Structure formats: C-alpha cells, structure tokens
Structure 1
Amino acid sequence: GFKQDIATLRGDLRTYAQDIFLAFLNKYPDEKRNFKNYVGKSDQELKSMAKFGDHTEKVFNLMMEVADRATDCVPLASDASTLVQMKQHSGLTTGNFEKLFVALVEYMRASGQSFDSQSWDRFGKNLVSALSSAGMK
C-alpha cells in the first residue's frame, strides 16, 4: 500500500526521483518553461548534471515526507502551506502539480511493480486540493 511504496521509493530515491521527474518532463514538454537549464538535453545528459540530480532528489525527499505525514493519503495543511509559500514555487499553479502526479501514477502503472497507484492518484488530487486551499491559483 501507500506506506510501503514510500519505503520502496526511499530505498532507491535518487533513481526513482530522476526517472519520475524525466517521465513528467517528457510527458509535458511545455513544463520545461519552469526549467531553462534542461532545454536541449537528453535524459542521460540530465542525469549527468549535478544540479538536475541534487534538485530532483530534494523535490522527492520533501514529497516523501509529505506523503509520510499524510493520513489516508490526505496531506497536512501545513505541508501544503509550505509548498505554496516557497520562493521557488512563486510562478506555479495547481496544474503544474497535477501533471507531476499524473506522470508519477503513469510511471507506477508501467513499472513491473506492486505500487498502489490508486493511492498515489488520490494523494495527488488531495495535494492539489490542499495547495488550492492554501492559496495556489
């Protein structure tokens, strides 16, 4: 279920973070508008870039904490507030987050693995709801 999937992802977090973030960037090419340093690079070149890995990992380190602190895939309002009020998220809207979670769920469905993809889908919807509530447009 959801709590085991957090354990699974954390067990190889750099790998999973980069693979899911590349699945998001490739599924939604316009989303490389929030990322000028990634333009004109292949996946292998992005994995070579220290920024790419350090940053993607820090995104998933936080996402897994927000997942871990959730009850029944419902994130804490305090974690939504943190995500809306981060200076790095100033230009963002809930659609940015929705797309990341669609990619994440798709990746999980496509994997050979017993991820609880329905729970991730619901968590992403609940996060987007909480971000909206917290004041994201």
Structure 2
Amino acid sequence: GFKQDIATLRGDLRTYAQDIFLAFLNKYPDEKRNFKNYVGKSDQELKSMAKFGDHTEKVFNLMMEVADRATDCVPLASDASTLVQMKQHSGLTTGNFEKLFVALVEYMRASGQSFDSQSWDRFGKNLVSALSSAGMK
C-alpha cells in the first residue's frame, strides 16, 4: 500500500524523482514557464544539469516526508501551510500540484510494480484540498 510505496520510492529516489518530474514536464509542457532553465533540453540533457538532479530530489525528499506524516493519505495541515508559505511557491496555484500528482499516478499505473496508485490519487487530491485550505489560490 501507500506506506510500502513510500519505502519503494525512497529506495531509488533520485531516479524516481527525475523520471516522475520528467513525466510531468513532458505531459504538461507549459509547466516549464516556472523552470525557464529547463527549456530547450531533452530528458538526458536535464539529467546532466546539477540543479535539475539536486532540486528534483529535494522536492521528492520532502514529498515523501509529507506522505509519511499523512493519515489515510491526508497530509498534516502543518505540512500544507509550509508548502503554501515557501517563497519558492509564491507564483503557484493548486493546479500545478494537481498536474504533478496526475503525472505521478500515471507513472505508477504504467510501471511494472504493485504501487497503490489509488492511494497516490487520493493523496494528490487531499494535498490540493489541504493547500487550498492553507490559502493557496
């Protein structure tokens, strides 16, 4: 289930973080407007860029902590307010997060592995709800 999937993802997190974020950027190319340095690059070129690997991993490192702290795929309101208040998220709306979790769920469905894709779908919805409650537009 969800808790084991957090362990699976942490067991290879760099490669999952990069592959899911690439899935997101390829499915939603307009999302590169927040990553202007990632424009005009192939997947392999992005995987050569120090901040692509470093920032994506740190994003997924915190996503896994938020997932681990959740009850029944419902994140803590403290985690939601943190994600809202971060300066690096000043521009964002809940729609950006919805799209990421759509890409994460689709990655999981297409994988060879017994990921609890339904739990991740709930988590993404619960996280968007929590972000809205904590004041993200």
TM, length-normalised to structure 2: 1.00
Deviations 1:15-60 (A, max 9, x none): 0000000000000000001100000000000000011000000000
Identity of aligned residues (%): 100
Per the TM alignment, residue 114 of structure 1 is displaced from its structure 2 partner at its CA by 0.4
Deviations 1:68-110 (A, max 9, x none): 0000000000000000000000000000000000000000000
2: CA distance between counterparts of 1:49 and 1:35? 12
Per the TM alignment, residue 64 of structure 1 is displaced from its structure 2 partner at its CA by 0.1
Per the TM alignment, residue 6 of structure 1 is displaced from its structure 2 partner at its CA by 0.1
1: CA distance between counterparts of 2:34 and 2:133? 23
1: CA distance between counterparts of 2:58 and 2:20? 13
Residue ranges of structure 1 left out of the alignment (5+ in a row) = none
In the comparison of the two structures, how many residue pairs are matched?
Answer: 137
Runs of 4+ in 1 over 4 A off after TM superposition: none
Specify the SS of the correspondent of 1:136: coil
2: CA distance between counterparts of 1:51 and 1:125? 28
TM, length-normalised to structure 1: 1.00
